[PDB]
Amino acid sequence: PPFILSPISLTEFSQYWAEHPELFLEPSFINDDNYKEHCLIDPEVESPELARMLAVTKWFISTLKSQYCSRNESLGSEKKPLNPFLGELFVGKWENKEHPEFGETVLLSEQVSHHPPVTAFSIFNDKNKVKLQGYNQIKASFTKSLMLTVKQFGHTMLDIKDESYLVTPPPLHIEGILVASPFVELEGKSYIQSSTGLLCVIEFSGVDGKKNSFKARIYKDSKDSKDKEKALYTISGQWSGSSKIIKANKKEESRLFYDAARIPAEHLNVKPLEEQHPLESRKAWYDVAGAIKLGDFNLIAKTKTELEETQRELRKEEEAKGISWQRRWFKDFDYSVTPEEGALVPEKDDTFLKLASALNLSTKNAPSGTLVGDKEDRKEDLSSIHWRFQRELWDEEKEIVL
């Protein structure tokens, strides 16, 4: 066992959707009057919608490394994920003081389900009108071989002012591939469907091809995505390393698209344990995390039972104050054709339904990226529940602060 063990609650993994402050906000600084300047990899980008789609694609790739690489040699740490308890919260903010034009970007993460485990999150920047929200859920199991496949469920939505993007995470990742390491590989297709019609398809190598490699293609619309030759741009390389982009078929003009080595200057600002509510992750798992570094499973069992008892009493107090701790900032909406009575239902102009339609994506609780008609989508009575952020609920939060 190498490196310094770092137990971290899965509720914290939500922060990796905006680890690079500048990449997260770039799309919002691109308008009709400067788009050609805001596109390093192609000073001759056809339209602003296209420059924004490239900026979004870059931002998406930048989130991958931290999500799937547990070891980090420039820090000497090995991440040990902790299964969040119901009602757990993790909040913080990127102050971006070194860039006044960016503004404060807030992160709210919450464990909305324990059985099964579901994490919901929202990252929003009021100043530039950039907001993201999504939820995550996985199902692991072994295949004929050490394999151990993890299916991804859920999706995320990005709003750049009035422009919308539907992002679906990597459908699959394989664990326990390399000897003596928690190395992980991605497989399947991820999509970035914009309200502008543009669609990006990101294909992961799986256990084949290069290590942690991908092939991204941007199409003018969903129909075009059926033929790889109609791709406006093609990006390929390592999502944990570097990649290059090629416009049309001009292989003679390949440019460096993204290099994961780049370390972000801005760090997520999280308040110290002293001023943290007992529902917040770092404070709730502190002892357990310590015991886990000690390695003593007797101390781990003890600290765990204590977290449980603490949390049990905390919930009682939360209710006593009339606080809906179980669904504090996110509510579960039913998107099925015929929902149950009391179920929260979507609105008529639901962004998710619009974009999913354009992409022809299953709106059911199937693996991420499942297309309508796929085996997974045809399954008998599959639910269609999706978690949604409610800004107002955060606006009236009386206990949690940043």
UniProtKB/Swiss-Prot annotation:
Consequence when changing R312A: Slight reduction in cholesterol transport. Abolishes binding to phosphatidylinositol 4-phosphate
Main function: Lipid transport protein (LTP) involved in non-vesicular transfer of lipids between membranes. Functions in phosphoinositide-coupled directional transport of various lipids by carrying the lipid molecule in a hydrophobic pocket and transferring it between membranes through the cytosol. Involved in maintenance of intracellular sterol distribution and homeostasis. Involved in lipid countertransport between the Golgi complex and membranes of the endoplasmic reticulum.
Effect of substituting Y68F: Abolishes both cholesterol binding and biological function
List of residues binding 7beta-hydroxycholesterol: Q67, R71
Organism, as annotated: Saccharomyces cerevisiae (strain ATCC 204508 / S288c) (Baker's yeast)
Protein name: Oxysterol-binding protein homolog 4
Stated consequence of mutating E308A: Abolishes binding to phosphatidylinositol 4-phosphate
Phosphoserine carried by residues: S357
Positions of 20-hydroxycholesterol binding: Q67
MF (Gene Ontology): lipid binding; oxysterol binding; phosphatidic acid binding; phosphatidylinositol-4,5-bisphosphate binding; phosphatidylinositol-4-phosphate binding; sterol transfer activity
Gene name of this polypeptide: KES1
Keyword Translocase: no
